[PDB]
Structures are given as C-alpha cells and as structure tokens.
C-alpha cells in the first residue's frame, strides 16, 4: 500500500494518517463531541447506556473515502490495519465488533497519574529531585 | 582488529568518549506545585517523628565533669523522662525475656 | 570531566548498591527511632529470623540490656514479629521476624490521619478535626494506645465521654482493630501449626491412603485456619457490652492498635476516584467516588487472604484458588448493593438530573443508569448477577488495572513513540523484528532507539532462536516476549529505592542542620521566629524549612506509587 513508499514509512503522511482516525470518534462519540467538555468537567453530558453510541468500521470507511485526505483507496482490512496501529497510544479502546470509545483524550490534548501535563517537573537547580532511572 | 566492526546505521563521531553521564537524568513529575494540602501533610509529617521523638520511644543514644559545680546545685533537672518499664503495655502481647526490661 | 572523587558523594553511586527492601526500612528507622533500632531493624532484614543471641553476636551493641530495650521499643512499633519455638531435648529460646505492615503505619502516618479527617462525615467542626487528628496521632505513634490510660489522662469527664464515643466509631470502620497473637506471627508458621496438629490426629490403618488423608488434612487445616483469621479481622466483641443507665462502652483493659487494612482500602479506593477523574469527566464521576465509599468499609481482602503466603500456592490443579476468590467474591451478599441502597447515601450537592441523554431528585431509576454504564464499560469496574444488582469484582480487575498503571508509568518515564512499542508488544502477543513494523507502522529509527532505551528496564524479555543445535543469537534473527511479572517486580524495587533516596536526603539534611533544628523545636521559641534570631541564620532557617516542606511534597506525590504495585 502506500505506506511502503521509497524505502521509508512516510514520517509526516502516516502521522497525519493517525490523527485524523480519532477525530472523528471524538465529535460522533459524545452528545456534542468535544465542544461538551469546554464548558468545564462539572456542565458534560455522557450517553445512556442502551443507546449505540459506538462506531462501526463501515462508518469510519465512508470517512475516510468522502474526506479526500489521503488521496488514496483504503482496503477494509487497511482501515482495520491503521486502527490497529493507532489502537495504542491512548487513542481508542477495544470493545467487540470492532467500536473505538475515547475517555481523556481532551483532557490529554488540553497524583492523578493518568495525566501528568498539569504537573511540570522541578525545573530548578535545587536537590531531592527524583529520576526514574537513578537505580540504573 | 576489533577496529572495523561498525554497523551501517552507526558513525563514528559517536564512538570514543563513552564515560557516560554521571547520573541518569529523567525529570520525574512528581515535582509538581505545592498546595496548601500538600503543606499541611508537610507540617503533620514533621509533627510526627517529632512527636516519636520527644516521647519515650528513642532507643537511640550510645559537661560529665566529676565534679560539680554549685551553679549546679538548687539547678533545674533537664528532663525527667518517662522509662520504658514505667509507661504501662499489656503482657500478653510482649515475649517473656521482655518483662523483665519492665517493671512488674 | 568528572572526578571520581566527585562522584559517590553528590552522585549517590554508593547508595546504588543497597537493596531497597534494606535501605528503606533502614532509614525510616533511623529517621523515626533511632540508630539502635535502626541497626537491629536491618539485622532482621538482613537475616529473616534469629534470636536475640544472634543480634548480639552480629551488632556491635554487646549487651543484653540495652538490645533487650531496643527491641522492646520496636515490638512496642509494631516493628517486629516473635516466635517461641521449642526444641524439646532441652531449653526454648525465642526468636525474632520483622514486622512488614507494621512500618507502613509509622511510614503512611501522614496520610493515615489525613484520611480519617477528610473521611468522617461530620468534618465541619474544628475542635472535632483537632481532637481526632490529635487522637489518632497519638494512636500511631504510641502504637497499643489504650482507654484505661487515655481516659486517667484526660482531665474533665465530659471531654471523657466523647472519646469513648468516638472508640466504637473508629472500631467500626475497622481503624482500631483488637491486637493478639495474630498480629506477631510470621504466616507460614502458623499454617504449619494448623497442618502439624491434623496429620497428629489421624488414627492408624484407616483404609484411607496418604493422598486421602493428606486432602483431608489441608482442607480441615485450611478452614480451621480461615476460621481463625476471620475471628479477630472483624469483629465487636470489645464493643459489645453495655452496662447499665450507661452508653456503649469498649473494653477498657484491651490495647487499641490502628488497623491498616481497611485505611489502604480506603486508598485503593481513592486511587480508583482519581482514575476516574482521570478518566471520566466530573459530572457522573462525582457520583463513582461515593459509589466505591459504600463498598469499601466491607471490601473483600486486596491481595491475598493470607492464605496464599504461608504455604506453596499449587502444583497441579493451581486454579482453584482464585476460583475460590471468585467465588467468595460473588458469593458475599452483603457487599452487593441496589440504586435503592446508594440513593440513602449520596450527598444533596450531587443533583443527578442532567448525567444522561437517552437519545442521540435521587432518582434510583438514573443511579441505576449510571450503575450500568459502570458495569458495561471496557474496563471491569461492575459485574452483573441479577438485574438491578451488582458487585465490584477483584478476579479480571486487578491485572488490568495493574497493566495500566505500569504501562502509564513507562509512558510517563519515556517518550511517544516508546509508549506506542509498549502497547504493541503488550497488545500484540511474541511480536518480532517483522511484526512490530506490520503492526507499527511508524519510523524505525525512534522505534528501535526508544526500545533500546527501553531495554533496560525488566519491561520486555529478550529472546534467543537457534537456527542450529547450539545457541548463538549472533547467527539468527531472535523475537521478544512479554513477560509482565519482571515489569511488576522492577517497579517495586526502583519506587522503594527512591522512597529511601528521599528519607537518606531529608535525614542528611537533617544531620547537617540538626543545631539549627533543635533551636527551633523549642517550646518558647515555637511559634516566635522572627524577633530572636540574626539575619543570616533566621533566612537560612526558611530556606531549609521549606526545602523540608518541599522534599515532603516530593514524598506524599511519589507516596501514591507504590502501593499499586503492592497487590498480588
């Protein structure tokens, strides 16, 4: 496919690949999308649980073929092979029958350790800093 | 010679200074900014330890002059600390060459 | 270039080489006792079990007094546990194990008080806040505080009655638990008392053979011994009498000992609030964070029910075990709730009205639809047996949350990319050199460099094939492995070691300004800080105070760690 392409895996295309699949999982996902959780955590509105609000590959198919983004023909089993890919990251969640959910992905893109962004490090030349690679 | 194993993908500026740095460096962000929570378990931390400390419970010791001085007589004493056999604890939780540390 | 002298002291290569498990505990000791009890505190760790003897032949101290005192005191910490084996050709000695969970009270101190004050449901009222705060430091750092003595302490009868009101309170939540025998005594001793004593009470030629009568034994041993466990774990025989035209009184005469495990149940369960926070926004995870809090004061046991510690786990056969923690598990009526339950329980702040969409007042009916989105959501957080109710599951939930967390580490430690070879090589089952770019699809270059950098850690096994009979990976091309456990166990090791990094730096801090320190913790000069004191002295005072206040900062954030790898 058009992901070998002269010898290299295409750094700036296939990144723009990855970031265009969640996106639309982000704004069909929710009752508003991603516009729900700029009023703030405490005005979001969640889905009940009978209603489907999962997606189907058939649906993200017909993205990607009306989006002209790519410029190129996408297999089923190609589409399945980039939602593969990008499945890590923190991107979209496995459930069966192939459907992609997002939990923190605005949080992220805005202890409590799933997120760290709101956390900067010591940033001084002070002591007591700790580094997770000091024991090796 | 040892000299000529180098694979495509490696150059050979690199190569030669080694030595490492001195300590690995990853910022832990666990660093973050401090609250008036996070202060507070700061000052009861110190409170406790402390209090562990002022208390009976030091075990920890390893101007002692034979003669003394009359400004040392009628002078307050430093401290008249509680023993360890004298703070009352329960028998039955203790092992028997340890009553006799205790006052029965 | 650095020099060798350099290093080791501002490097803290010397520290490198101690074993976190010793150098830990070690310095909590140091911090909180005192050298004697530290030093006897890592003779214990060093040699699991010995006697007194051994102490004195192998530290320095020589003297039966003072290690006889010093050890008191740690047994008085909760420190230490004891054993009276007896050879019966001659005369008994007793010996000594460490205490493991005893240290975490001393260690967890902070948060421990910290929780019972944000935990009550009546906080509003300051002297309430002081007088339990106050109650409950004295409990841990007295260690078996008891009512006999804090009663003929406090001097006015009617700031009397409210501490034996605040006893049975504190029992019931399980923060005061009754010490015994069993809180000394090392695991797999005790089971083997229980499994030493029935193979002594079968009666010979019983036509049964050694299988059968070895079955029989274990299973009588290990329900006696679930018998035994469950007696004293929970219960209100202290809080039970009542005498006349009085209110609910506790035994006197018995010692009251902080518990930890319903404390570190109640951490669990914040750990798991702030996933959710995390992970769901804070309109229904307002309503998860008191849906867990009427689970956890009756939660099952975290990790192990001790009965996976005293003996070998299995051979052949080896599920039956977690089956039979599954099976308690859904077996336990009591910890199932319905929305009917919860709505008695949730605060008027939360409104519950606009949490859902059904299409594209303390409602039980809404409670009920939250309960479902928990139960069906990718992550096990609820199970359902019946409609209408269900239960908080620990068989399929801990790997996950284990997986998770560790994996989120590593994403917090490396970069994106190594992030993205994590997840394939733990998604994706044996990847090798082909699959990871079938199954990647990025540039190898950053791929390779972040798993390089990511081989260091105990995070992926490293793999040989032979193309021949003898083994040389050089002649064939080798894939990888998972193997999750050496991840698990290298997180422990490496979160102990900086834990005791920071308690070695605030205690040399504390070494290196302990005039300056014992100048301020005086009771005149506390509280008056600015008016007797030079310049210099007063401003470098500040400095290393909050320098403290900032490594006890560093301490509490990295304090929420390592508990998560402390599970099965």
Redesign the interface.
């Given at each position: 496919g058009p992901w070998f392409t002269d010898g290299e895996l295409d750094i700036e295309f296939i990144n723009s690949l990855l970031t265009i699949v969640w996106r639309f999982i982000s704004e069909n996902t929710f009752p508003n999308g991603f516009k729900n959780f700029e009023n703030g955590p405490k005005k979001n509105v969640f889905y009940a649980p009978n209603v489907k609000n999962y997606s189907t590959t058939q649906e993200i198919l017909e993205f990607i073929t009306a989006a002209q983004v790519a410029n190129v023909e996408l297999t089923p089993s190609n589409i399945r092979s980039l939602c593969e890919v990008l499945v890590y990251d923190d991107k979209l969640e496995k459930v069966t029958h192939d459907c992609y959910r997002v939990t923190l992905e605005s949080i992220l893109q805005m202890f409590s350790i799933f997120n760290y962004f709101k956390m900067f490090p010591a940033s001084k030349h002070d002591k007591e800093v700790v580094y997770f690679d000091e024991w090796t | 010679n040892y000299m000529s194993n180098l694979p495509f993908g490696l150059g050979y500026g690199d190569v030669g200074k080694n030595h490492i740095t001195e300590f690995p460096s990853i910022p832990l962000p666990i660093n973050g900014p401090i609250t008036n929570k996070e202060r507070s378990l700061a000052v009861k931390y110190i409170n406790f330890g402390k209090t562990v400390k002022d208390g009976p419970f030091y075990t920890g010791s390893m101007t002692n002059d034979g003669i003394e001085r009359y400004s040392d007589k009628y002078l307050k004493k430093r401290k008249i600390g509680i023993s360890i056999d004298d703070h009352p604890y329960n028998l039955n939780l203790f092992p028997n060459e340890l009553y006799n540390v205790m006052g029965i | 270039?650095?020099t060798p002298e350099?290093?080791m002291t501002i490097?803290?290569l010397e520290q490198?080489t101690l074993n976190?498990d010793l150098f830990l505990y070690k310095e909590l000791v140091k911090?909180?006792?005192?050298?004697?009890?530290a030093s006897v505190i890592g003779m214990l760790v060093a040699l699991g079990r010995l006697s007194?003897r051994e102490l004195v032949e192998k530290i320095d101290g020589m003297d039966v007094?003072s290690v006889?005192?010093?050890?008191?005191?740690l047994?008085?910490?909760r420190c230490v546990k004891?054993l009276?084996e007896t050879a019966i050709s001659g005369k008994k000695t007793?010996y000594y194990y460490y205490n493991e969970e005893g240290i975490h009270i001393?260690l967890y101190?902070?948060?421990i008080?910290?929780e019972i004050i944000t935990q009550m449901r009546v906080n509003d009222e300051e002297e309430h806040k002081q007088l339990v705060?106050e109650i409950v430091?004295n409990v841990?750092?007295?260690g078996?505080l008891?009512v006999e003595?804090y009663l003929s302490s406090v001097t006015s009868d009617s700031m009397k009655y409210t501490i034996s009101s605040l006893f049975v309170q504190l029992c019931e939540m399980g923060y005061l638990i009754q010490?015994?025998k069993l809180h000394?005594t090392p695991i797999e001793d005790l089971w083997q008392f229980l499994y030493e004593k029935h193979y002594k009470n079968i009666p010979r030629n019983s036509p049964l053979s050694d299988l059968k009568k070895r079955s029989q034994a274990k299973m009588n041993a290990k329900t006696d011994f679930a018998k035994i466990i469950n007696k004293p774990n929970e219960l209100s025989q202290i809080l039970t009498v009542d005498p006349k035209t009085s209110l609910r009184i506790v035994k006197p005469t018995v010692?009251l000992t902080i518990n930890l495990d319903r404390f570190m149940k109640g951490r669990r369960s914040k750990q798991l609030i702030?996933?959710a926070?995390?992970?769901?926004?804070?309109?229904?995870?307002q309503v998860y964070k008191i849906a867990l809090r009427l689970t956890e004061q009756k939660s099952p046991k975290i990790r192990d029910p001790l009965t996976q510690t005293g003996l070998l786990q299995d051979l052949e056969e080896a599920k039956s075990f977690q089956d039979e923690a599954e099976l308690v598990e859904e077996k336990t009526p009591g910890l199932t709730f319905n929305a009917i339950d919860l709505a008695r329980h949730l605060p008027a702040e939360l409104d519950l009205r606009?949490?859902?969409?059904?299409?594209?007042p303390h409602s039980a009916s809404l409670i009920n639809?939250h309960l479902?989105?928990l139960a069906?959501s990718?992550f096990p957080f609820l199970n359902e047996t019946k409609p209408g109710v269900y239960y908080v599951p620990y068989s399929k939930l801990m790997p996950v949350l284990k997986s998770?967390?560790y994996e989120?580490?590593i994403?917090?430690?490396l970069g994106?990319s190594a992030?993205?070879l994590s997840?394939?090589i733990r998604?994706n089952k044996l990847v090798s050199e082909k699959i990871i770019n079938s199954?990647?699809?990025?540039?190898?270059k950053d791929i390779r460099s972040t798993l390089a950098s990511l081989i260091?850690?105990n995070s992926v096994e490293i793999q040989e094939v032979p193309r021949t009979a003898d083994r040389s990976a050089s002649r064939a091309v080798f894939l990888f492995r998972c193997k999750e456990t050496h991840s698990y166990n290298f997180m422990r090791?490496?979160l102990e070691?900086?834990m005791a990094?920071?308690l070695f730096?605030?205690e040399k801090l504390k070494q290196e300004n302990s005039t300056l320190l014992k100048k301020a913790?005086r009771d005149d000069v506390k509280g008056r800080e600015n008016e007797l004191l030079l310049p210099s002295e007063l401003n470098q005072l500040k400095m290393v105070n909050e320098?403290?206040?900032?490594?006890?900062?560093?301490?509490?954030?990295?304090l929420?760690?390592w508990e998560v790898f402390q599970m099965a």
């Open positions: - | - | 270039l650095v350099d290093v490097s803290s490198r976190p911090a909180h006792l005192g050298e004697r009890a007194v007094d006889k005192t010093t050890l008191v005191s047994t008085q910490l004891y009276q007793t001393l101190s902070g948060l008080i910290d705060a430091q841990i750092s007295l078996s008891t003595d010490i015994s000394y010692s702030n996933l926070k995390t992970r769901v926004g804070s309109v229904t995870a606009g949490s859902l969409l059904s299409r594209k639809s479902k989105i069906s990718n998770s967390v989120y580490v994403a917090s430690t994106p992030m993205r997840r394939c998604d199954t990647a699809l990025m540039k190898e260091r850690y090791q490496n070691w900086n990094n920071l730096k605030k913790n320098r403290e206040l900032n490594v006890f900062a560093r301490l509490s954030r990295l929420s760690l």
